[PDB]
Symmetry: D2
Subunit: 380 residues, 4 copies
Amino acid sequence: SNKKTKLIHGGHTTDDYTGAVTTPIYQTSTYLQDDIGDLRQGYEYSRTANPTRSSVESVIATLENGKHGFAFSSGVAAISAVVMLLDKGDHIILNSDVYGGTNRALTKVFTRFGIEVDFVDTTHTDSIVQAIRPTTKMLFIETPSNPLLRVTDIKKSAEIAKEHGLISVVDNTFMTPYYQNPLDLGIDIVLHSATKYLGGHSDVVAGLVATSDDKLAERLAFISNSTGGILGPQDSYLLVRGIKTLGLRMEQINRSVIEIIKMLQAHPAVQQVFHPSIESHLNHDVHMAQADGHTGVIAFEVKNTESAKQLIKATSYYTLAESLGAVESLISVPALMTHASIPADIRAKEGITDGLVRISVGIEDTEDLVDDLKQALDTL
Amino acid sequence: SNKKTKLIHGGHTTDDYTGAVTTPIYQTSTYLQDDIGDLRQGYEYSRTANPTRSSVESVIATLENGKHGFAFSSGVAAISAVVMLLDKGDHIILNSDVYGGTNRALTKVFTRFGIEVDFVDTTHTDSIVQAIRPTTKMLFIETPSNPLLRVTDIKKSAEIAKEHGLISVVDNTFMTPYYQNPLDLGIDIVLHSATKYLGGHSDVVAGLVATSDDKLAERLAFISNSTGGILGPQDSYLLVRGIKTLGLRMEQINRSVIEIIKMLQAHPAVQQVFHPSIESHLNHDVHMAQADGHTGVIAFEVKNTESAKQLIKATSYYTLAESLGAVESLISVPALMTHASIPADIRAKEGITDGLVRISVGIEDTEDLVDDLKQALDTL
Amino acid sequence: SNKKTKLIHGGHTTDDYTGAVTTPIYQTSTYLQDDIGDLRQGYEYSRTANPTRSSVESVIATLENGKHGFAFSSGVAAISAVVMLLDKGDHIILNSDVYGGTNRALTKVFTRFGIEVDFVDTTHTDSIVQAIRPTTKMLFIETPSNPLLRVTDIKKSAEIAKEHGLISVVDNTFMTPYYQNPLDLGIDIVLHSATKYLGGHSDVVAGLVATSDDKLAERLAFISNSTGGILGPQDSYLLVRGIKTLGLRMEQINRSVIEIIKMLQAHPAVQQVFHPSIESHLNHDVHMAQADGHTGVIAFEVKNTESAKQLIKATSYYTLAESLGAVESLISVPALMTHASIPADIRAKEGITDGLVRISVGIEDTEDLVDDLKQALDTL
Amino acid sequence: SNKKTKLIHGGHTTDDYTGAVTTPIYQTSTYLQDDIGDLRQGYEYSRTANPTRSSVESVIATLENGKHGFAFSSGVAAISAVVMLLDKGDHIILNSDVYGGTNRALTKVFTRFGIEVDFVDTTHTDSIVQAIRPTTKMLFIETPSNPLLRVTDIKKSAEIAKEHGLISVVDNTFMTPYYQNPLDLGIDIVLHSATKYLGGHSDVVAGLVATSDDKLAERLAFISNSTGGILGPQDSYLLVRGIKTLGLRMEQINRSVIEIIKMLQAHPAVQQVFHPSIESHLNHDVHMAQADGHTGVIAFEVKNTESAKQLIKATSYYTLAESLGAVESLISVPALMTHASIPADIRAKEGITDGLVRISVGIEDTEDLVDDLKQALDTL
Ligand SMILES: O=C(O)CNC(=O)Cn1ccc2ccc(Br)cc21
Ligand SMILES: O=C(O)CNC(=O)Cn1ccc2ccc(Br)cc21
Ligand SMILES: O=C(O)CNC(=O)Cn1ccc2ccc(Br)cc21
Ligand SMILES: O=C(O)CNC(=O)Cn1ccc2ccc(Br)cc21
Ligand code: NA
Ligand code: NA
Ligand code: NA
Ligand code: NA
Ligand code: NA
Ligand code: NA
Ligand code: NA
Ligand code: NA
């Protein structure tokens, strides 16, 4: 019924045979056949299907109200599988500030295979309509985006995509199925870096894909079986396990996010704050209309590089590392860590200033995270 | 020094920090940075590099006398990564009876990205020379091949590839680094389905790639990081562990292979036997010149489908399942299990008769495997 | 600082060497020595010490404000290790309704080794004073107890134990270190079945022991190394991982517990309810004084066996299985599952009626758990 | 039929449900019940029984020709469980040079519980007959023993034990079920540190017990369930996996053992060599009559401590670490590492000289191990 209950009881995460209340880990590559072609339970080769992976696939399908789930060895493997629904000569529209790994896969791997790519600012959906070519076959959006949390209208993107015969795809990593369900809004395919919130514990690299479309699912299965970027059984198990606490973790993260944003907006050493909960944020109304909560990623400006480094050194509970969606609160400086290859002037123009800090809020005590960040800001 | 010693002491499979005599399992996605950019031990994100995966990568690099190792989520993910060294418009020569999954990846995924593919019978290397187009960039060979164990001259293929500016690739799955080292013979890239002999225990799906070429390695690393078909840490650990007994397993398998072949050639219910150890096998001399032993895969003809099914039912120690390189001896009928989509007449023309049986010899007692197969054949 | 923060940042759960933000899994039995006796990082044999186990041991030591942690293969192995601090001829006082496995270990294993056992109702601590013999060496209490949740004054028990030279032990399983810290109240040794709340996900069987006493710790280490009931590295890792969400899980469980108890007290088909939050519960004041929250175990009476079985069948979100502290809400009937060997009349006298139901509240949605249990009760 | 076949096909190591050719890893603590008491497949709580552990238990039962198998968290936990078949006042006869951990468990833990212990030199079985008291209930022998490889007549010990009403126990760690089957010779209980040869890869700490006696098995099950030193599922899986190559590993180890002993007997820097294959070794005939091969543990004398340390430093392929039965060849100096607490004069009297070296032969190349040890000895 309700979400926290569905997290526990939705999908197949028990063993029908023994009754084990957790999914067994099928550390196996192949399966006995009783007669040639006769498969006891539908399994014949683990690359094609593995029962632990099938369990996590059913979880993501259930959580996104889809029919089909697919587990990949990483988020970018999920993205690559989805892009491989296209042919040489096909064209993709992506939101212009799409994830660096996504940008790099598309512009440096798949353009060598004749996939044409255009980045457009989808915060105004009519941009999509302008960018559509006769060869356009896919519309790929993250919302909210990294690191400035730009919001894109999911329902309108789905309508545009249906009208123009496009496969619509949403990278729902930042929101998780707990707050935002793109398939409910008309999108064809939803994907996740389960490396982030879903696994939740910084100990799995994994991607998950869900869809309700039987032909898209058949094609995704074929691509998974042929290019073989499958998630292994141990990681599938740890994914199923981490997802159990998704709702509790996201809700704690959200309480902390609200309070941290109040602090940041009040602090003199902080200039701009980027997060879809702020009412002056572009498409705040759209986000509230398509999501029931918030990502834990917040970005904000301090003065310069020296202040950002000082902030990192002075916090006790914000940890300097890559990635997001940990139980630990994570801190980073995009201009130095994710966007350093970009010329300084283009970083400035895009808003990636030297003192732009990104925090990923964890599940520590709210008052501790607020006070720690505030005292560190006070050292500026 | 000697191979069985190198299997134990080659590569990095201990923990420098604690002294643990086995590789720790780094079930982790991200790593603390002491200062922005400062990585304690070179790790920053597990998709990019993980220390357990790095350990198995160093093992395969060492075993193939290469400089660089790469671990993928499956053999076909390794193959796909290697194929992605090419661009739209490039052309690949493969041996004509290449592995079904390889055939399907190339002809159904990568041809949609403009990769051009030609299958040629490489048992005569001048066929390669005839097939070379101005657009040809890669030469990809398995030797021996599945299911008829056709042998291709590795050294001559490497020379042809160097002369014509081609990346040469060998799928060394069937022989393993224990018996055949293509990089020693001039090949650019060697790959494996570690799902088979290397893991050895039917409990890992994995691919491994090794090369000595720094620029090819840099490109492979970039492809791995961008398309993300990485092997996870638990599977990397089980791979390192299974490789320890590779030499013992392969040698037992070889003793059994020799004796089983004597039996099969003597038996009246068996027609043709396919294996590179038989002196009348095409390129027997070539195989002996480029390998120090034999694959455990043998194929042989019985009369028809009914005799093949009876053979399977009557053996006590040959197990009906997909895959090869298990500790168990495996048995299959290609015409029904791997080549059933092919019209009957083309199967006959290629030698995939209804009574063509493939066995993958395991590590059971030699006399037991010989006697069991013989008594089952006697029931025909 | 605050508890939810300490759960994340307390103890050693990262890799100092690589910076991995999670504890590496040292699936290893032995360690290189650089010179005879020279241990790189203090490890020499995994039974004696393993770095993943050491990590979980430091977590439990930190969470209980102790100095020393010990991880065992199960809760009853932890209990057995602690009991083995005694000699033949020594005497133990336990609370009279102690856990069945504990009762059985003491009365059927350790009495054969000359350990003398007396069960006393410790809800009045002067009972302890009466039961003390010249040979008494240990006082062992659970609070609250199973299945009727009897509360024992921890601080007074510790004082009595100090005055009389007794080792005091608390089985803190039901409360967890998140709500109750017996070492802070003078107790010598605190233990847990980490199989329940601490692991939290029904996928580890494990025991944990913490103490601040250096000589007790030395003796426990000696017993662990000699009788060898050690927790393995994979289970230690899953324990560390499950503990991260302990606070979030316990707080959700507590919100649901409060609401479920309101429902149960109002319902006509329910007679008595047993839980330390009810103000008429014996030693309610004591529990509130020594704990900051509540166990998720509740017991309550329906009419008879048929009503209890009907309750189980009619609930959608209460699962029939053994154990407690899952993410799933669990339901059981003690008179049939844990106390069936006891004669019916003695069960009645102890309050284990045929319609005594025990629920272990999970982390499902509060309103769903309340409504589901209520509609099931309405079917009576 | 034959041993190498039985290693592969004996016991239950597949999944009946899916057909998985390896035992699934049941990382689980509890099991759904369909009705109260109704267990789908006989499982209800993982401490009591776990299906992965049950799989490894069936393997050890099969390999020792017993009926019942038990997996413990370590070898010393197996030993402790077996000793707990006794009561206060009972008496045990052990062989006088029994394993240090065994000696310490008995003389420092179980004597505090009133178990009486006598060490006797069982190389003459009439010593047992002299040592038997009216209170003696158990006879516990290792053969061959550590570090001097003393051999005890198993069949005669079993007869003596039957005549006098004693439970007979053999620690069969050094020989493995591959070469020596004490239950076939009348012994009641056989146990192993599976930490050594059976796991075989230095990555599991585990104990295994097998018996054919239904009442002894019932008592062992009760002790396991009450004191809880159970092996976890991941370690049970790695045990099942390592056992597959037991025969191949032991046979390689034996070839190397024969050749190394020839070298050692010929070398001038080596005095005495201890191994049951040497024909002048005490009870050589007995060992050959009760075993089909040899342990990989060899001990031999060099001049002094300085020569032993030099030997260790000069070998390339002998690794200094604790434990035995690795794939690596291990080297140690008992007088410094396992027997250092013993006064020097008593070490001399027992034969534990300062230059007594113990090697545990691994699976490296035979010629490499011989040559490496010989060149190191030549540096003396
Ligand atoms: O480091 C990386 O992967 C590159 N950086 C990115 O994240 C993605 N990206 C690619 C081109 C480009 C232009 C402006 C901005 Br703003 C971002 C851009
Ligand atoms: O089932 C499969 O994947 C198809 N079969 C194969 O294995 C590969 N393959 C693809 C075309 C083709 C023609 C003749 C022969 Br012979 C084999 C061929
Ligand atoms: O099944 C079991 O293990 C036994 N039952 C228990 O839980 C523990 N126990 C042992 C004696 C005894 C008397 C009254 C009550 Br009330 C409980 C008792
Ligand atoms: O270090 C240890 O655990 C002690 N040493 C041992 O291995 C066992 N042991 C115990 C008494 C004793 C006397 C002579 C000899 Br020889 C060995 C003895
Ligand atoms: Na919604
Ligand atoms: Na739709
Ligand atoms: Na060679
Ligand atoms: Na080369
Ligand atoms: Na408190
Ligand atoms: Na104290
Ligand atoms: Na024998
Ligand atoms: Na017997």
